[model samples]
Target: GLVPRGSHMSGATEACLPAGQRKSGMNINFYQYSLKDSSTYSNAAYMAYGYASKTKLGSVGGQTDISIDYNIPCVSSSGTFPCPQEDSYGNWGCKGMGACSNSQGIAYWSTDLFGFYTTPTNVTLEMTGYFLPPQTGSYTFSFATVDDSAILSVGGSIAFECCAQEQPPITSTNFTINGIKPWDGSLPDNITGTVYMYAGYYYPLKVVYSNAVSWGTLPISVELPDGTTVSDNFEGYVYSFDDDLSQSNCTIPDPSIH
Candidate 1:
């Protein structure tokens, strides 16, 4: 039920719009870069506007070799941070469809060394593509992190960042939001930011997350304009992205929205 959007950078995404591809999910990319060095990750690696067109990593499949498309149930195990608690960092999972055991896949919210690692480390995740708004109104987006940093850009420009941890011991980062927007790395008590999206609009969406050392959880979810918490949906309904690389047609609004 997307609305109030369409007509972006391509005739390709236009082909899929009003409704994106068959599976509504995000086009994912994992980049290992140093927070202290901008050269580590390409300036274009994190850019959301023309990401579908970027020729990085030799442009394999227009991005990286490891790039994967994640459908719904893509968030942290229904807010579990890391399912199984600590069986493996990749355990942060998405819920099931038919029953508790039906779901699959890691959250892309990866982590390493719960004890701690060297400063200025690599390990970042970028999910870029379209967001099909289930309802039309003001939607609230929020962030969570154990030891990480994140930046989300919608419609092309940055909308908000994760900062001011709600609990004690706020964490900071040398890494900037996609190496552009600077923000303190911490969780917020309330929604990080809000955006007005009409139902049916395939809004261009991009989320960049980074975890340098120790622990981190970077799953993201939104509060629908109608008050539905996206993560609350067992199938992760409404909080899905279409992986179709041909579907990046929403023009980024203004950075001022950030």
Candidate 2:
């Protein structure tokens, strides 16, 4: 039997949309960077986004905000910071991911450190999901801005808060996002959501030596101008690690000093 939503069933799968309603597809755009002073740890981070349980149906759709947690190693055997390395084929590995390129230095792992070694630093993280709208109808969306910085783009156009500024971090901000011109393209119209964060340091070290660390969780409620509302929230997560090159276990092969 086709189960309906809010039925209180564990795994119910009823048609959430109308018979002829169109479906929604999504795409994710993500980027990361590591600090230069970060020898062992690449300073670069990874983005984790995937299907969570099931997708929403009908005029309403579902979305999951990117959630990440930062952590440094509890104890580093090597004296240097650790960062994963890319092989000739452009593949990254953890075992051969030593920091020193020469034989005289020690191996360092950065992901093992918990706090920033420097001060006044900044780290930025951004992610976007492109949505395809159904039919040639006007769509309405309400979203709040949160974090050190953030913005949204829709219908292949830049909408609100599309710039970066040095401001104190906030937990949540609310606003409406809609399309002025009705989309007349494919079955589903395409819209995008983006976010950014600043840690407070320079380029290479920008991520490592952060002065202020913040966490942002914002709610997104939307109406399709047709009077349909979808509610969701965004969360900010980050962790730190140590990367020392002089640790004992990580012994480097020294030609003369050996």
Candidate 3:
């Protein structure tokens, strides 16, 4: 079931929420990308962006656990030589300097889901689809929190994510995505992925799950006429799912008994 939680809260099957009934509010979407040039993808600026029906980041198990890995680089280093000596100031020195180096590895990225409250345990929360940049790139992602989990896949990749549990205080959470690029800037990329979720109660409880797939494009590219390449980022005006399911507004069906 694409829906995360419904009646019973534990081991209960999620209903198929209708596109017209899914909840809507401010949602924060997060994405990570590796740029050939740091100057082009300003670290000080917003790399990826998302809109949620709610504002404040939600919680899982009374706590918000956020973990994101990007293809960024690191700067800290241990050393290079096998031998080291102590300096006159009592400082240990090695043949090679322990300097910070640049890398294009994945780090951590996350944000707090604010404003929205957990839906009724037995009620349905639908997410139809969302508005993503029309690009030719793939993405990887996942989402899990307190007592449940949910995921969205696009073009052999992940686009939207959500998760939660039903034990003690019910909580909700989502995931940050990687490899996502804007349309029109890349090539024919098959956007595809899966959705997984588990909902239940304390210690001894059952888990619920579901999955889905989608594909399409809007004719966008990343290469410039000057022979320079560009990175994919969420920009421009985003519409609402209520307006058009095919638009950039992320929308989903209401959670209903399947």
Candidate 4:
């Protein structure tokens, strides 16, 4: 019976979230497009999401590490992999193909789960989910093996982006968040950016990863403000749909992601 109201924190825009985001929340909605655009990352927004994708790879949840280091082999009629042959690059090169050996079967487009992806090269991936920050601090997002390109954005602020497909394998450029560059000048295997967040707030998270040619890697991860790396399922910090959270309410939001 004293103060007018609690402090009003900015951000957590309702525009970024759907109207009824709290009523019915679910796990990540993943989609994989067998088609690939020219020298770019996955454009899920333009693709038809009429159906949900069951092809899950890497760890678990939205934080699943999409690492295809080894070349994706093709299966011949005899079910013999390495369908082609190893190249001078010291890797088996099977670029465009489908699941079950693509076996000239377009039906396996959505059901192919052999490993990483049948269209391993020139493939596009989109991961959409809801995230609840467990702690109010700086959350850093990382995208490794910047082949082609990869993008991650939370709420509405863009987190991290890497080099394009035409660019070299890994470069120490194009790692930005909210227009800020935090990484020191070093030839790291990946690129990263940090955004400040508030505990208990829910935000829409999206990742667009595209692989071009040969074998590639795109293991994504998030590091908490205190330095705890949250990847591989991301534990309790990550949630789908309207989760029954007991610790905090979705009232306060932050504006970091910059």
Candidate 5:
């Protein structure tokens, strides 16, 4: 009972009609049909006209980049780091510190960096990139870690900060220094919000994590508007840092460019 892909049947043989039955031969058509037009064909015969459909958006899998600073000061048991002073613009005043870079989208991390983490302690990580949403809708961004702490931002505004230990407690005021902590195997943290996006458009995404006094792992995921999850990778160039905080500073690119 299979018809050729583009073959059209004309006239009423037994197959073409009761009255108005005509096979256009197209696999799929969205046009509206009149009752008489539909009645011309038998339900059984019309069932053969069904076709599968799939939709794809052109704006998936946007690019993201990251930098990791491996020379931050260790945090005390009180969950506070004696971070070196920052300048007027809030940039860390420390110099000679080591850093790393990644061009791939954010995902996972497991390896030690540049043997600097052989002892694996206090370190800082910053991620910069654009996210392309398939459509405009509410989405929940989630993060999982095995020995790290993090803060996620969208369009330069804080979306969520989780599991970071600090003396005064985690707050936006001192998030840069106090918001970093180690994970203790609790449930993964999530932030829910609505995002208005169009196909082929990209929005800025930035995330910062500080690994304090211990080598740990980090895994990040975001649930799309359609309920699918995506992750990132941990491969990139690694830079080294000097022991003295005052003598350790590295240049990181502004997040706005990408």
Candidate 6:
């Protein structure tokens, strides 16, 4: 009769042997183990199986960060003075008037002093921060207003200006202002240009606006490298002539990674 065949084994047959019997042969290396020990093998296994967590990316779309100063001294019917100073009326140009803050980037006033000042004419707005470009290509920025003028600057240079219907000279930064004009209750004014920027780097950005009239609105926005248009608050501070700039009341949180 033929010799009886051994049963098939799913795993290693040597691993199923008794601990003492398994170690009896020099070829068998059976290191004893127990759940109660919870010492060497268990600790190593647990460490090897552990997982590490990661943080979330930040939202890059929304209103741009801006600061406004109301009742800015009007040097002329169409011009105004620089920011961060006081006029003759005991009003702090950017520290002590009827100032407040807006987490949203959009700024508007329906009535005089609407909420931050006693008057509306000669109102000034300043926004400075880093803008994350959506892509690396030509970009355009547009501005619309009802009364005064607005200017956008990137990397300390004027990128776009309005209300005078003029376009500034192009710089090494590769950005241009086009079709700039005052809003006349009809189609909105526009400024378009080409800016080569990487997707991951944050480019320096600044926008300054002046409202020469008492009743008007200045809504500003920019078009990304892509065709998609976006408007929202950026990461920065909005100081007014009404607040005490000397006192550190607001704090900017650390920007999140992409």
lDDT of 6 by residue, 195-229 (tens): 44445443444443334333334444566666766
Show the lowest summed lDDT stretch of 10 residues, model 1. Answer: 162-171
Q: If both were scored by lDDT, which would come out higher, candidate 2 or candidate 6?
A: 6
Clash number by candidate, in order: 14, 55, 73, 6, 17, 12
* Candidate 5 error regions (>4 Å): 1-120, 156-196, 233-258
lDDT of each residue in 111-166, candidate 2, tens digit only? 21112221111233322322323322344443343322223333111211111101
Each prediction's TM-score versus the true structure: 0.46, 0.27, 0.20, 0.51, 0.35, 0.36
Model 4 lDDT on a 0 to 1 scale: 0.42
Give lDDT tens digits, candidate 4, residues 107-168: 22222322333455545554545566778777888766454455556653331111111111
C-alpha-based local distance difference test score of model 2: 0.23
Off by over 4 Å in 4: 1-70, 74-118, 156-188, 242-258
Best by TM-score: 4
The number of clashing residue pairs in model 5 is 17
- Residue-by-residue lDDT tens digits, candidate 1, 1-258: 344343344312210132332343444455554434333223333433223233322100122121112122233434333233233323333234112232342223222322123221345555544456677677676653323455665542232121100111111222223333234333453336566665564555555655443334544557788787764121323233323333354333322121
Task: List the candidate 3 regions with Cα displacement exceeding 4 Å.
Answer: 1-114, 117-124, 144-146, 153-239, 244-258
User: Weakest 10 consecutive residues, lDDT, candidate 3?
Assistant: 208-217
What is the Å distance of residue 30 in model 6 from its true position?
A: 79
Ranking by lDDT: 4, 1, 6, 5, 2, 3
Model 1 RMSD in angstroms? 14.2
Q: Could you tell me how far off, in angstroms, the CA of residue 175 lies in candidate 1 after the best superposition?
A: 15
Tell me the spans in candidate 2 whose CA falls farther than 4 Å from its real position: 1-25, 29-123, 157-212, 233-258
Report, for every candidate in turn, its global Cα lDDT versus the true structure.
0.38, 0.23, 0.23, 0.42, 0.30, 0.31
Query: Is 3 or 5 the stronger prediction by TM-score?
Result: 5
